[PDB]
Enzyme design. Sequence first.
Site, PDB file in Angstrom:
ATOM      1  N   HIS A  73       0.780  -1.248   0.000  1.00 52.22           N
ATOM      2  CA  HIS A  73       0.000   0.000   0.000  1.00 52.22           C
ATOM      3  C   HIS A  73       0.809   1.295   0.000  1.00 52.22           C
ATOM      4  CE1 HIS A  73      -4.316  -0.023  -0.673  1.00 52.22           C
ATOM      5  NE2 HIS A  73      -4.107  -1.342  -0.688  1.00 52.22           N
ATOM      6  N   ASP A 137      -8.426   4.186   8.198  1.00 52.08           N
ATOM      7  CA  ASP A 137      -9.660   4.352   7.415  1.00 52.08           C
ATOM      8  C   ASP A 137      -9.988   3.141   6.546  1.00 52.08           C
ATOM      9  OD1 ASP A 137      -9.872   6.938   8.505  1.00 52.08           O
ATOM     10  OD2 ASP A 137      -8.817   7.872   6.810  1.00 52.08           O
ATOM     11  N   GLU A 252     -13.458  12.891  12.340  1.00 51.75           N
ATOM     12  CA  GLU A 252     -12.723  13.195  11.123  1.00 51.75           C
ATOM     13  C   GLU A 252     -13.384  14.421  10.492  1.00 51.75           C
ATOM     14  OE1 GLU A 252     -10.301   9.150   9.871  1.00 51.75           O
ATOM     15  OE2 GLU A 252     -11.366  10.281   8.308  1.00 51.75           O
TER      16      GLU A 252
END
Length: 498
Positions: A73, A137, A252
């Site tokens: 990632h 997330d 958030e």
Amino acid sequence: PWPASLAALALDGKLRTDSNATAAASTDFGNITSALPAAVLYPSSTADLVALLSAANSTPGWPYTIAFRGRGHSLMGQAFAPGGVVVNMASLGDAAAPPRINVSADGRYVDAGGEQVWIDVLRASLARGVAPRSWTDYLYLTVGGTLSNAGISGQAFRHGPQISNVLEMDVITGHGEMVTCSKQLNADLFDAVLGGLGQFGVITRARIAVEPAPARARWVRLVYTDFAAFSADQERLTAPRPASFGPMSYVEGSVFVNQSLATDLANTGFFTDADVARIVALAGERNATTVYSIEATLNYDNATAAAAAVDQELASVLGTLSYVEGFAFQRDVAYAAFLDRVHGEEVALNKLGLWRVPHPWLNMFVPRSRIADFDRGVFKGILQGTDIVGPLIVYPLNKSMWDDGMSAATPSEDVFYAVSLLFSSVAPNDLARLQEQNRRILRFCDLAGIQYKTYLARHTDRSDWVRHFGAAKWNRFVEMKNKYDPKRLLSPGQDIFN
Ligand SMILES: *Cc1cc2c(cc1C)nc1c(=O)[nH]c(=O)nc-1n2C[C@H](O)[C@H](O)[C@H](O)COP(=O)(O)OP(=O)(O)OC[C@H]1O[C@@H](n2cnc3c(N)ncnc32)[C@H](O)[C@@H]1O
Ligand SMILES: *[C@@H]1O[C@H](CO)[C@@H](O[C@@H]2O[C@H](CO)[C@@H](O)[C@H](O)[C@H]2NC(C)=O)[C@H](O)[C@H]1NC(C)=O
Ligand SMILES: CC(C)=CCNc1ncnc2c1ncn2[C@@H]1O[C@H](CO)[C@@H](O)[C@H]1O
Ligand SMILES: *[C@@H]1O[C@H](CO)[C@@H](O)[C@H](O)[C@H]1NC(C)=O
Ligand SMILES: *[C@@H]1O[C@H](CO)[C@@H](O)[C@H](O)[C@H]1NC(C)=O
């Protein structure tokens, strides 16, 4: 010559040099840089990792750098071993016996292999009525990968990042030694490894703190046209009570540029077409070039009185805030569906061919005292007039919940913002333009005197990494590199010692 244990890996087909093996371990999520390794190791056990790392430490003039690929990632080649050995970490979880995720008998923690993905850690924890406290997330990342960075989401203000929620680890150093570490035992390795960017060794096991699992999440979105009111409310929702935090389980925030407002609101997956039209009319009344949204949750269990108690709790919280009158939007979902919310967007973007595209993401920590200058220069400045594809995430963090002895670097202020501009590149015209725009954002910050820290970025200059950690912390990082990876072979794609 090859040591018997290293040759055994090749003989058993664990060490692969074929074009298929090397090509798969040459690309990452960023899709901007590529680097072909010489070989890929598919370990079946931690002894195989000990075998490769011991063979690296015991071979004079060993020329192969070693990288530990989680799910790849990384944005700018951090998981590559150019002309070296990439470890395919997922191969440790193949056997299915013995298990790689074990919830403790007392339900106070979860043991997970470094290669394990957070979605699986969540499934195994929930089956025992518990769940980790601090998340990311996106759940399709490894425990080892997120711990080598920090691991941040909307819970980090109260529980700290994922690096602040580890009891202990098993780490194989660059010496090829299997070492168990915590704050009490081999604390130096424990601290160096957390936020350590895969420089000191491979995490084979991490003991993660857990909490009793909530059943549902009351999920809210609050809309602002005023950045000062938006940032004051995020700080109010995340401020510690006179150690002790408020009722919110997650906080958030998002920035919406006026140009793509209607499209971006619809693309959240949260707002209905009626919600979108109201916000579009609001922005036009206020003559706003930017719209802001707080995203917050209140976790709760399957109790009979639960729903009504959260309705009352939320009503009290909302009353203390300054969002536009009537702009409170609610959803009520099962906890795991909110945790795995980003997985649905991955499926949708991949079918449109917008997942395997370049990701010139800009992630940073901006000190609280300079967020309003950042908003003016960036959201109200640089980004204006451009076509934005991807979310713009802004939320405050509390420095008290971060351990400065760990490798992860944060700004010196008590409150600082996670600023993640998740740009998705469409045409080749776009990639070069997006990369220059990030260079211009950082230039603006440097010229305005903003003491930010980058997150998920690898620097190419030694002066940049020294400034990133701070000189005194840099000497600590180097001391730890000399004790744990003297040969400077681990995670070369970070470009610190390679
Ligand atoms: C792609 C992505 C990433 C991401 C995210 C959403 C998406 C779609 N949301 C994030 C969030 O909300 N919060 C956060 O903190 N990070 C978020 N990310 C970034 C993610 O944390 C990173 O990409 C990170 O690298 C973890 O990903 P992955 O598990 O895929 O790791 P990698 O890219 O292959 O490797 C990264 C570096 O760490 C070293 N590494 C990997 N595993 C280990 C172990 N077990 N031990 C030691 N080092 C390890 C690699 O060698 C590489 O240098
Ligand atoms: C927000 O952005 C939209 C552009 O998409 C603006 O609305 C347009 O403005 C021009 C100039 O008068 C018109 O000719 C267009 O027909 C409008 N388009 C739409 C879709 O409404 C709006 O001006 C912007 N607001 C601010 C404050 O910058
Ligand atoms: C620190 C870092 C790198 C964080 C990265 N996290 C994310 N990465 C990618 N997409 C995200 C993320 N968070 C939310 N979304 C999507 O953005 C929208 C949320 O309104 C949805 O479409 C949701 O799927
Ligand atoms: C980006 O991904 C695409 C699609 O898989 C591919 O054509 C290309 O090799 C990748 N580029 C880099 C630089 O990794
Ligand atoms: C509305 O905002 C624009 C761009 O921010 C500004 O230049 C313009 O003069 C404004 N008009 C008003 C407030 O009447």
